[PDB]
Design a protein around this ligand. Structure first.
Ligand SMILES: O=C(O)c1cc(C(=O)O)c2c(n1)C(=O)C(=O)c1cc(C(=O)O)[nH]c1-2
Ligand SMILES: OC[C@H]1O[C@H](O[C@H]2O[C@H](CO)[C@@H](O)[C@H](O)[C@H]2O)[C@H](O)[C@@H](O)[C@@H]1O
Ligand SMILES: OC[C@H]1O[C@H](O[C@H]2O[C@H](CO)[C@@H](O)[C@H](O)[C@H]2O)[C@H](O)[C@@H](O)[C@@H]1O
Ligand SMILES: [Ca+2]
Length: 338
């Protein structure tokens, strides 16, 4: 049996989309309606507000700190907005966070006009081992765009700290890294092998975990789940007729849980659970375990804290689920002797 203690790190957030650990029990969090909050042991502080398209699954979403933070004080956000004609689109922005009087300054757009909708806006952003910013996007309710290399929809993007496609991107002067995605909301890198992983929502069933290769085509909408065809990279997990609704995902690392080292943690929305996936040598699926089924309701993000503790966000305030007192929250999971 797995043994642990869970505390509430913060509460009554509105759809806390993304958590970025600062160390010393401080955290930056986005709330989907358009705000970036600092969480401290002390209390809750509003860093920045944003006028976002706060409708359906759109709003203020991913959050990433520059790999050199706080020395290079750059903070990246992924945000929905109403474009010309009232259509929902998505952008990636960046500001300098003042390490004192925590305030955000010189916010500029890096990437504009990503397609968007009430559904399928992607949204997860994270720096990988190569120092590049990766960005997930959904098919914006328009599945064919996922196969279209002239479109930013249904992709995983990879750009530098400035939003530029690196010369070694797979496609000519293009931010695209991989394609054929429906609605990916989770990415991480295995801390030893550097293998990249991503989650995805499937059409009802067929939620996925994928190993992300440079220039890979993940099949949507020509294929869903394990299709067994040469032209599409298949998922390593395919939930079949079951629905997880996975978003955020992180590989476990650090001192806290040595026996979970290199397992993949996945927050599930409708699944209302934390999935844990054990990868063998050469990234074969050894085991999948399932935690907290229906105790907290909908879960959205999962990240490892500076000490190796597991941070989770709840998402019952999107009202696709029912509320617990003081939802939504950030929960921290530590080992028993802590
Ligand atoms: O089949 C389902 O029941 C189901 C549930 C959910 C959910 O729990 O919100 C999503 C999806 N599907 C889905 O396809 C999807 O792209 C999605 C995005 C989100 C989100 O909250 O950002 N939820 C869901
Ligand atoms: O994204 C690729 C292309 O998609 C559209 O074309 C497809 O859909 C049409 C129906 O709306 C058909 O007429 C067409 O034959 C399909 O290939 C779009 O019209 C194209 O411009 C895109 O390149
Ligand atoms: O045979 C159907 C599968 O084809 C591809 O997988 C093969 O090709 C890859 C590189 O060409 C190999 O790495 C892989 O191990 C082979 O199985 C495709 O990527 C799979 O999704 C298909 O199911
Ligand atoms: Ca797929």
């Amino acid at each position: 049996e797995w043994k642990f203690k869970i505390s509430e790190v913060a509460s009554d957030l509105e759809v806390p989309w993304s958590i970025a650990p600062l160390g010393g029990g401080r955290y930056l969090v986005t709330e989907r309606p358009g705000r970036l909050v600092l969480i401290s042991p002390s209390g809750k502080k509003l860093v920045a507000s944003f006028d976002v398209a706060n409708v359906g699954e759109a709003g203020l979403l991913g959050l990433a700190l520059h790999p050199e933070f706080p020395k290079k004080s750059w903070v990246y956000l992924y945000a929905s907005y109403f474009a010309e004609g009232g259509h929902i689109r998505n952008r990636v922005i960046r500001g300098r966070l003042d390490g004192s009087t925590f305030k955000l300054k010189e916010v500029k757009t890096l990437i504009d006009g990503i397609p968007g909708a009430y559904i399928h806006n992607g949204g997860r952003i994270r720096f990988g081992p190569d120092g590049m910013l990766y960005i997930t996007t959904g098919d914006a309710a328009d599945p064919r765009l996922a196969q279209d290399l002239s479109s930013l929809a249904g992709k995983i993007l990879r750009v530098d700290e400035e939003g530029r496609p690196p010369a070694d991107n797979p496609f000519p002067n293009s931010p695209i890294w991989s394609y054929g995605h429906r609605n990916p909301q989770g990415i991480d890198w295995h801390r030893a092998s550097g293998v990249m992983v991503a989650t995805e929502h499937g059409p009802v069933g067929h939620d996925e975990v994928n190993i992300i290769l440079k220039g890979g085509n993940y099949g949507w909408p020509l294929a869903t789940g394990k299709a067994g065809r040469g032209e599409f990279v298949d998922p390593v997990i395919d939930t079949g007729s079951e629905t997880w609704a996975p978003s955020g995902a992180s590989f476990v690392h650090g001192d806290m849980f040595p026996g979970l080292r290199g397992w993949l943690l996945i927050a599930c929305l409708r699944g209302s659970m934390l999935a844990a996936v054990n990868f063998g040598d050469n990234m074969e699926v050894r085991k999948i375990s399932t935690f907290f089924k229906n105790v907290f309701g909908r879960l959205r993000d999962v990240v490892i804290d500076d000490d190796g503790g597991i941070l989770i966000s709840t998402s019952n305030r999107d009202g696709r689920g029912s509320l617990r007192a003081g939802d939504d929250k950030i929960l921290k999971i530590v080992s028993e002797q802590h």
